[PDB]
Amino acid sequence: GSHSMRYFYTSVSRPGRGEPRFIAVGYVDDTQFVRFDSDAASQRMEPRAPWIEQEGPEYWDQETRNVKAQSQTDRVDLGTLRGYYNQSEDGSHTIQIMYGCDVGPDGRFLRGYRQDAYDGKDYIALNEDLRSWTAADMAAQITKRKWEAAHAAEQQRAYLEGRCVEWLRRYLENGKETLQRTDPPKTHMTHHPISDHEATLRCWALGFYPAEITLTWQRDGEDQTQDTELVETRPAGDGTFQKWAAVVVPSGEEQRYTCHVQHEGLPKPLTLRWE
């Protein structure tokens, strides 16, 4: 199916003392594979997946130098935006950046992304055509005017259509034994009486990859949303994900309810029933 590479950068100023904190993480699909943390000892981009470790020292040197330079750009930008917003230098503020590319099942470019935030709100974003910008406010509009004059979109686009897709393909092949295998959800249901007359059925999905999944409850074959609850999909910590959905039912009527599990690793949706 389709695949994605994404990088997430967070820069947080530290007005009491010293340089902003800068954290960068890189993902292929739902697998982290690199990180940089300005507070760490290496001062280097570091591997976080086994299949990236085979890259040679020229890879790590280049990636370290590019991410450090970007971190210094974020430093300058925190000062610039403080001025645009007329903010005091007493306060801590945050810039966030997400960017990357998707390839389709053919391994060819599908879509590119570049989006920036300030203090958790949209600031400026590259549009889907990779030729225009959306600025959320008048401060971002200044940036947009500067980036148009600098032809920033063209530089962003060349990366997203070029090196981004080229190295995504390389990672997917080098990491294929995990990156291109699906782990279907391991499912089961639990029963919890809450009274002499009611019970909670909880439908569990465990150990799946990728994280995208749909859990739905049906009563007598009809989608049921009343008296249900769904938790946010969460990481297990071993690279897989977990989720559950629950329903309150009249005791003795459990057999009417079915949990339906949809996932990329499932040729057919799974149906579970407390029998």
């Binding site: 590019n66 610039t80 981004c164």
Partner: peptide, 9 residues
């Protein structure tokens, strides 16, 4: 790989 260093805001 990461993108290159960009234009300042």
């Amino acid at each position: 790989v990461v993108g290159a260093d960009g234009v300042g805001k």
